[PDB]
Amino acid sequence: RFSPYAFNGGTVLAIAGEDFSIVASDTRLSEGFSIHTRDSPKCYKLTDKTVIGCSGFHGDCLTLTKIIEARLKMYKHSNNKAMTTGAIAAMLSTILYSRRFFPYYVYNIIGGLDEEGKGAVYSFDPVGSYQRDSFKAGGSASAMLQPLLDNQVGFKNMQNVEHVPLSLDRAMRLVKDVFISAAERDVYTGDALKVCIVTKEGIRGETVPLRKD
């Protein structure tokens, strides 16, 4: 018959530091065993302080992004100000939920800085539940990324070790290395990397090379 949803792969990783929030994703867009194109950025920009990733069916990633960017302007025109990171989460929770009976298949991870200037990451589900966390992942490689962060970021399972808040200098090499580890062992990840770092100054996009196979 007709199968409306296909899995296009993709991987999203967010880390909320004290002064920074990093949202990174790969470029590979692939349906089935074939690669359509090796540049398809998952990271999309909403406001200056907010970057949203979309991991899932690519047609919903394109539609949902145009719906969000439409309601950013509906808010900015009505309220004469940009949406806060917490407001984008609460809105997109109701946007994803209005589809409850024919859901969007996507994994949204919103990250950036809140009113306090601190990294705020909101991870969603296709049905629109959301909760704040220091680090989240998504997509096919989400299962590989999370255990690595529980150790380095969370200092779990280690007795008598000091807890130092993660530094951007260690966060850059932490995001790059988990993908170098994930792109190897995952077939849906590779061919390139985009890191969009959200600080108080602005968004800085950094591209990293990954295994091409």
Binding site: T37, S40, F57
Partner: peptide, 11 residues
């Protein structure tokens, strides 16, 4: 490129 399901890109 476009597709039935709405998947679209440029290559």
């Amino acid at each position: 490129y476009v597709d039935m399901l709405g998947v679209a890109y440029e290559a």
